[PDB]
Design a protein around this ligand. Structure first.
Ligand SMILES: O=C1C[C@H]2CC[C@@H](C1)N2CCc1ccc(C(F)(F)F)cc1
Lengths: 193, 191
């Protein structure tokens, strides 16, 4: 009962670590069971299959991505919605550049969940924060009154591509610097502030 | 000879998948539309996804040719107006039901995000980098990294079309999305 609850946490922790390091395709459930110090039967009781355990890993990784974005925006000192947006764009490049986030969210998740599953999880975690920053900037008069959800969706498409471009670049250090420059120019062209 | 079988199969698949979606039409029904046997089809395409990859190629080639046609007909007088016209051209062509079904709905599912991006970039990066470079040369866009800006714009415009494609009210989503893209592009350009 308590041991099972503890087994579920140990399996998610161990899978996150090993798949974070080597990728979904390169670590099997037996090696994860051993990492967690539990039997195959205890694992199979919690997770029907490998993809089921991956879905729960993506959840805790996405929760941590969104918590780290909120932390970096709160840590930026941003005094205006316009500066909160600037800080959030920089925070996304920072968080998405974490090697575990790159491996699990940008490379493995779209493959293992498939397109519809991956976008549903991506939207559930990102749309709320994006729409909130936009709505605050509009209320402050730092962004033109306009449909919130369409602007949110277009910016998510831009920011998703920015992360994937850096994730797969020959020189990610240069790609990240130049992509940050491009995004900053784009938002500074729309922000009244 | 193989060429003729492949052309018939790609044409038939484009038509039927265009109409009902990848999920709803099997290779035997495509074989019949093409007037070829299952054996001749399977010789050319190991599986359904293989034929879909060749359909996406021909459709994206046609999309980019139609966009170049609409930009030529727009009367755009400056590189800035060429970019505005290309965005309007993509919103126009993306509303073609076959393009919506094959590129916006089926292609991301069948190819995945990495496969979809690869095809998107192969067909649009060249033209997008050209428009950006001409706008920079004309002094209508700040000197900045061309490839990164191209990639971000491609990702933004592809997402805009998918948002419209799956919206409860696509007429309203298209109008509001066009308004958003206009503000984003106009914020990007000088004068
Ligand atoms: O066949 C296609 C159409 C869609 C779907 C995949 C990829 C290639 N994509 C290109 C979208 C695009 C539109 C306009 C501009 C421009 F030129 F206006 F900046 C760039 C890219």
């Amino acid at each position: 009962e308590e041991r099972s609850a503890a087994t579920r946490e140990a399996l998610i922790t161990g899978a996150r670590k090993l798949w974070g390091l080597r990728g979904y395709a390169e670590v099997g459930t037996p090696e994860i069971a051993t990492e967690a110090g539990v039997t195959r039967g205890a694992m199979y009781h919690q997770f029907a299959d490998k993809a089921a355990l991956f879905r729960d890993v993506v959840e805790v990784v996405e929760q941590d991505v969104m918590a780290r974005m909120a932390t970096l925006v709160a840590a930026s000192g941003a005094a205006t919605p316009a500066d909160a947006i600037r800080a959030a764009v920089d925070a996304w490049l920072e968080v998405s550049g974490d090697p575990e986030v790159r491996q699990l969210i940008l490379l493995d998740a779209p493959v293992v969940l498939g397109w519809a599953g991956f976008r549903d999880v991506a939207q559930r975690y990102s749309l709320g924060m994006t729409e909130q920053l936009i709505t605050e900037a509009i209320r402050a008069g730092q962004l033109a009154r306009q449909p919130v959800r369409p602007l949110a969706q277009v910016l998510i498409g831009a920011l998703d591509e920015a992360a994937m471009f850096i994730a797969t670049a020959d020189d990610p250090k240069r790609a990240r610097r130049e992509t940050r420059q491009v995004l900053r120019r784009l938002i500074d062209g729309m922000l009244n502030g």
